[PDB]
Amino acid sequence: RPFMCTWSYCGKRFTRSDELQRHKRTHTGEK
Numbered sequence: 001r002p003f004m005c006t007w008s009y010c011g012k013r014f015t016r017s018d019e020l021q022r023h024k025r026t027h028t029g030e031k
């Protein structure tokens, strides 16, 4: 179960979707 971020200009892997959770929030911030 690979845990990579789905975004352009990113391409970052992790050892637990947990990090992918707080990571996807830094891709579309500015709210």
Ligand SMILES: [Zn+2]
Pocket (backbone or CB within 6 Å): 005, 006, 007, 010, 011, 012, 023, 024, 027
């Ligand atoms: Zn990312």
